[PDB]
């Protein structure tokens, strides 16, 4: 019945850990805090609704509180219950939601069931230290990654340059062939062999060039289909540690906050 | 990890000779061996002499018929107009060249090279382009280049010396008193020179006017002095006066500022600075022919694809009767471990901004192999209830559920669509989606600050949709028809009126309830009284129901404007609509000066990444200032630059930086030899940090030195203007001072003479850093901020000297850094001093001897007021004897910020606000002048008052640094991603208590960081002067 032991009242908490708390929650969800103003006497309702976490304020005035005007309550506790079972729709009469999940303080801490504060503090630093480690391992990672996902761009353009290359080598072949053949018919009709060969001799070389460049792409387009694979590999890693460096973190946060309650305080 | 980007694809340099396959029209080819460094003249000459003994060399013509064509790097088939070219210089990709018989439009094609090379990519890319939208942005943008160009060479000569040296002025003509009362009784000396035929001898006359004076009068006094001796009638000296007065025009010495303008004389930037630090102005005075004459005729020609040719039951949105539908068909992909991940489900919402129209929606989950749903997701949405700018957001997302109930989620690739087209076309239909990587440090499911559209890259999963058809076009319905439905929907006060008042007070981030909403909804009518609540306004509309946007529409359209300060807000991430943004853009359009837009530009060029559509208000505003203004154009040019590898924008990018080549005139020759300098500099330091880097420092100068030698090098790196401030000029490089710093990415330290004919009266060294390897995108915004702390203060008549050198981010993780002068880190003064407390005061001493050492002690004192209240607000990564520096002449400053607001609450958990710069003795020694107790000297109770009053003054100005680092949130910083990342400010200059709790509180952060020592002279009930 009092404020001070409700299970949805968290106190001096920020606005900013309330939207991590109420995150992609159903709507209903709600909790309260202080203002964020501080005055001593003023808590503020945070209501989940339509994908988004409303801000309601409770209005304390001679002994009495009040979403709207009318004064009509005596504890805050009272108040939450009130609309905690009826419909909201005496607060404002549209799209009354009332109040159906609270964010309570207590399956939290069941988190953290070590007895006493030198417990705490050792498994905070086996956690900490777990955490910047696996930290050091993701930062690494996204590293690799950004750098793979550079190369294989540089990779693609120089395929596409490769390509544009052996057309305009293999435009020269179908060049040479329009011309010389009017010539070779002549070379041969007026004596002359050598000048035949040197013809034929660039036509080798250009040819054999264009087997060199072919390759040489080919190459590339091996070692573009090798690294395509390292950079997936890589994603699925990132994908795979994502979510318990998340997790790790807010366990390690848990336990600071842990540590910090059962401390001294001021 | 060794591909390269330099002279050839896979190598950096070329060998010194190289054989180069040279293909002829006969269909021969030719091995040329050719120099590095020859010119395509020389090449072809050699090519042409050498065919001749080859065979069907008679079909060859005159070599003068031909030009090179071969492949560059970016894979384009380039053309060489221009033979005076170096082979090293082509970027070609293989050693080849092919010869050709020129066709075509020859001056376009060579244009469009030049614009190619100036934003990273061929122009040809774009005619490519199958999206309608981005061919009618071409098309459409035009109109904004011919409307500059002809308000350029309107009012030649001078209209067009304007946009070349635009004055560099303050916002205000109004001299703050501490500025003022450093003049002689409202008079300033200036130093105006004259370069004197035949000889070019420099003579000197030194004036004593009212700072008041436009530089015509400036002039006017000039021709009095100098027409002293010759002395005549007054009436035909004021005559004379009056007669050649505007035929001449000043200049700053030593740089590239003009004076042609009529502000006041103190109001150039220049100027103000000289009254401000006790230096004496030396200006140069010039014939207004000599420059005039100098001036590039900017002509600017319509391109081809402005004259190309490109190829019923239209319904009102408001007039489909159904709820807000849409198709999950299929991906094509996941990169997930399949032994880690237990399901796969693709999430969605429809958003407004950052703000939901409604719940998200989530498809059913599927397994990692098999990623297909066929599912209809239904919105608690009616489509007629959809606003204007309503989006799709949604993500791939991962599920692991192996510990009790709890489980994991991780989005694997987000996406983003307009669920109108630029055309007001509600979409339809199927549609398939390449997904992007989710940003480093982004936990979200969905990504709404994203960018909208498809990866360019379509090697990346890509999600197959459907939306919903009507048998029919829909189109957003016209204004006519929703402002008459306005009309149809609309049919104590002295406490509710400062109650309104006190709401509009308060800054962007803070808290307004859902009664405070419903309250400002509900007066909404009277809310025009007091214009600036309007984006608090705006916040109370429910975006998802037609009936209130149509209202909030009305009210826009008549709206009075708000300043410039806070109409910047509604240009970041939560403003989207149109309507909305058109009002901002219409505010900066009538009140935010050329000096104000050249501040915020950094954030007004991040904000057009929020735009819906490559063509919107906002864009077309600050092209026009870029085309009307060189100094904004250079600093858009460059910002925009600096982000063209950024997939999520290179598009839109690249499409405005070409359309603003195309219209800047001259200037876009400035930028190619700036562009090809900084590519020069990007090469050298690539082949030392691959190639060279296990090699000892010593072997590396001696690489550089050898390099910088080059001719093709010397041409590059010489004759230029600088990037950081292209006022400074750069000359020929000063071998014998450039250098390879001793850090780890191997900056360089270069040195170019000063080529303005005055350089020995100011910047005789112009002294540049280039570094190739950090991101400096968080220097440059931190920076960016002390320079606009430093401007608020200095307006209030508070003198606190900071030190915002330059800082330009110029590529992905390039950039170049101003060389501070006469600089020295606290470690560095400690090793010079074996060092007790009093090593730095005494280092101070021997460098301020005499009658100057109690100003280098003011200087010192009110430079640590500066950057003590600066670094304690933004929280700045934890200084050190390493990161903070001082000048000879006593002023400190810090270096080095890349950390800032909470990271280190991410990483380590503490909730605190820390005090990054903690004064140690050292310091407090000096502000005393070496007193024995210094926390009860009058010096430090003077120090103390600077810090509170510098303190205030920020917090006074809150909005401003809100809104600019709200504007920067889909920048990609990963220090800045979330307005829950701007909350540390928040707390800093305690937004939510008083100002009174808020200075208490300053105070309360100083003495627990400095242990004691910070005291009050207010009483502390009501903060009035207890003493003196």
């Known amino acids: 019945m009092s404020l001070q032991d409700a299970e949805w009242y968290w106190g001096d908490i920020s606005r900013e850990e309330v939207n991590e708390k109420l995150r992609d929650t159903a709507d209903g969800t709600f909790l ?227 540590l910090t309650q059962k401390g001294v305080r001021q | 990890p060794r591909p390269s980007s330099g002279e050839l694809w896979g190598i950096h340099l070329m060998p010194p000779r190289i054989l180069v396959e040279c293909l002829l029209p006969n269909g021969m080819i030719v091995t040329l061996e050719c120099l590095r460094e020859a010119t395509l003249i020389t090449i072809k000459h050699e090519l042409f002499k050498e065919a001749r003994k080859y065979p069907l060399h008679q079909l060859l013509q005159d070599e003068s018929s031909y030009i090179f064509v071969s492949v560059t790097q970016e894979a384009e088939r380039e053309e060489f107009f221009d033979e005076t070219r170096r082979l090293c210089d082509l970027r070609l990709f293989q050693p080849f060249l092919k010869v050709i018989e020129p066709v075509g439009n020859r001056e376009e094609k060579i244009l469009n090279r030049e614009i190619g090379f100036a934003i990273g990519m061929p122009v040809c890319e774009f005619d490519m382009v199958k999206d309608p939208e981005v061919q009618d942005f071409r098309r459409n943008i035009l109109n904004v280049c011919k409307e500059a160009v002809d308000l350029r060479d309107l009012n030649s000569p001078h209209s067009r010396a304007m946009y070349v040296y635009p004055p560099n002025v303050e916002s205000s003509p109004e001299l703050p008193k501490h500025i003022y009362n450093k003049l002689d009784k409202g008079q300033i000396i200036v130093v105006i020179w004259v370069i004197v035929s035949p000889n070019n001898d420099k003579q000197k006359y030194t004036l004593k ?287 509710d009126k400062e109650q309104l008042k006190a709401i509009s007070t308060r800054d962007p981030l803070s808290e307004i309830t859902e009664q405070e909403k419903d309250f400002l909804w509900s007066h909404r009518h009277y809310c025009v009284t007091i214009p600036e609540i309007l984006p608090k306004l705006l916040l109370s509309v429910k975006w998802n129901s037609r009936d209130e946007v149509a209202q909030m529409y009305c009210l826009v359209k008549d709206w009075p404007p708000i300043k410039p300060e806070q109409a910047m807000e509604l240009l970041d991430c939560n403003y989207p609509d ?16 050329d000096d104000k837009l050249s501040q915020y530009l950094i954030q007004l060029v991040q904000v057009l990444k929020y735009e819906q559509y490559l063509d919107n208000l906002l864009v077309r505003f600050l092209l026009k200032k870029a085309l009307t203004n060189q100094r904004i154009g250079h600093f858009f040019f460059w910002h925009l630059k600096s982000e063209m590898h950024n997939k999520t924008v290179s598009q839109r990018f690249g499409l405005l930086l070409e359309s603003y080549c195309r219209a800047c005139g001259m200037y876009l020759k400035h930028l190619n030899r700036q562009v090809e300098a900084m590519e020069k500099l990007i090469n050298l330091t690539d082949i030392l940090k691959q190639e060279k880097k296990d090699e000892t420092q010593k ?178 990564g934890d200084r050190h004897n390493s990161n903070i520096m001082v000048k000879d002449d006593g002023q400190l400053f810090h270096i080095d910020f890349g950390h800032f607001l909470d990271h280190k609450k991410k990483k380590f958990g503490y909730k605190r606000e820390r005090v990054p710069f903690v004064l140690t003795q050292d310091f407090l020694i000096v502000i005393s002048k070496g007193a024995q107790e210094c926390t009860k000297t009058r010096e430090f109770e003077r120090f103390q008052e600077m810090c509170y009053k510098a303190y205030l003054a920020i917090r006074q100005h809150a909005n401003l640094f809100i809104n600019l680092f709200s504007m920067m949130l889909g920048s990609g910083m990963p220090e800045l991603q979330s307005f829950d990342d701007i909350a540390y400010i928040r707390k800093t200059l305690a937004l939510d208590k008083t100002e009174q709790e808020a200075l208490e509180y300053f105070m309360k952060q100083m003495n627990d960081a400095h242990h004691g020592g910070w005291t009050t002279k207010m009483d502390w009930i009501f903060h009035t002067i207890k003493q003196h």
């Open chain 1, 32 to 258: 309260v805090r202080d203002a964020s103003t501080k005055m001593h006497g003023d808590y503020t309702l945070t209501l989940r609704k339509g994908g988004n976490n409303k801000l309601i304020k409770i209005f304390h005035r001679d002994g009495k509180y009040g979403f709207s005007d009318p004064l009509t309550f005596s504890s805050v506790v009272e108040l939450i219950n009130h609309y905690r079972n009826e419909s909201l729709a005496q607060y404002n009469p549209k799209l009354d939601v009332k109040l159906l999940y609270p964010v309570s303080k207590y399956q939290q801490d069941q988190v953290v069931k070590e007895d006493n504060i030198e417990a705490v503090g050792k498994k905070l630093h086996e956690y900490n230290t777990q955490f910047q480690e696996k930290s050091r391992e993701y930062d690494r990672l996204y590293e690799e990654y950004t750098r793979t996902s550079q190369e294989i761009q540089m990779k693609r353009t120089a395929i596409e340059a490769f390509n544009e290359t052996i057309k305009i080598f293999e435009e020269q072949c179908q060049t040479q062939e329009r011309y010389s053949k009017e010539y070779i018919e002549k070379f041969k009709r007026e004596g002359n062999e050598k000048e035949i060969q040197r013809i034929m001799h660039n036509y080798d070389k250009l040819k054999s060039r264009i087997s060199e460049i072919i390759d040489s792409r080919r190459r590339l387009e091996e070692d573009l289909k090798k690294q395509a694979a390292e950079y997936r590999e890589i994603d699925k890693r990132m994908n795979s540690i994502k979510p318990d460096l998340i997790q790790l973190r807010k366990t390690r946060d848990q336990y600071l906050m842990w």
């Open chain 2, 209 to 495: 006017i009212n700072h008041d004076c436009v530089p015509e009068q400036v002039i006017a006094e000039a021709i009095r002095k100098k027409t002293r001796s010759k002395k005549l009638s007054s009436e035909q000296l004021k005559l004379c006066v009056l007669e050649y007065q505007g035929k001449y025009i000043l200049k700053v010495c030593g740089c590239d500022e003009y004076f042609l303008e009529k502000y006041p004389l103190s109001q150039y930037k220049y100027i103000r600075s000289c009254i401000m630090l006790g230096r004496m102005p030396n200006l140069m005075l010039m014939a207004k022919e000599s420059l005039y004459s100098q001036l590039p005729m900017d002509c600017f020609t319509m391109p081809s694809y402005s004259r190309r040719i490109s190829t019923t039951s239209t319904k009102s949105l408001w007039v489909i009767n159904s709820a807000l539908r849409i198709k999950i068909l299929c991906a094509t992909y996941v990169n997930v471990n399949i032994r880690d991940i237990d399901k796969i489900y693709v999430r969605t919402g429809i958003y407004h901004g950052g703000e939901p129209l409604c719940d998200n929606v989530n498809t059913q989950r599927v397994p990692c192999s098999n990623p297909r749903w066929n599912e209809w997701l239904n919105y608690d949405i009616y489509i007629p209830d959809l606003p204007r700018a309503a989006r799709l957001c949604l993500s791939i997302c991962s599920v692991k559920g192996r510990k009790g109930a709890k489980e994991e989620h991780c989005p694997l690739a987000w996406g983003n669509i307009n669920l109108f087209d630029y055309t007001d076309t509600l979409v339809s239909g199927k549609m398939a989606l390449n997904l992007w990587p989710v940003p480093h440090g982004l936990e979200d499911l969905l990504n709404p600050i994203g960018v909208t559209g498809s990866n360019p890259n379509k090697e990346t999963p890509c999600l197959e949709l459907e939306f919903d058809w009507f048998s029919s076009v829909v189109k957003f319905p016209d204004m006519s028809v929703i402002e008459e439905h306005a009309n149809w929907s609309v049919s104590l006060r002295e406490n």
């Open chain 2, 578 to 593: 149109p309507m909305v943004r058109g009002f901002a853009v219409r505010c900066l359009e009538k009140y935010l000066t």
């Open chain 2, 699 to 876: 072997v590396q100068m001696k690489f550089l030195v050898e390099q910088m030698r080059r001719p093709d090098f010397m041409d590059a790196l010489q004759g230029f203007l600088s990037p950081l401030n292209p006022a400074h000029q750069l000359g020929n490089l000063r071998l014998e001072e450039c250098r390879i710093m001793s850090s780890a990415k191997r900056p360089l330290w270069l040195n170019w003479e000063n080529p303005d004919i005055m350089s020995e009266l100011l910047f005789q060294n112009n002294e540049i850093i280039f570094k190739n390897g950090d991101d400096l995108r968080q220097d440059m915004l931190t920076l960016q901020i002390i320079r606009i702390m430093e401007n608020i203060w200095q307006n209030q008549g508070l003198d606190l000297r900071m030190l915002p050198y330059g800082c330009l981010s110029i590529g992905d993780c390039v950039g170049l850094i101003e060389v501070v002068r006469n600089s020295h880190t606290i470690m560095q003064i400690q090793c010079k001093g074996q060092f007790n407390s009093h090593t730095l005061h005494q280092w101070l001493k021997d460098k301020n001897k005499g009658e100057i050492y109690d100003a280098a002690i003011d200087l010192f004192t009110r430079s640590c007021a500066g950057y003590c209240v600066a670094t304690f607000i933004l929280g700045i």
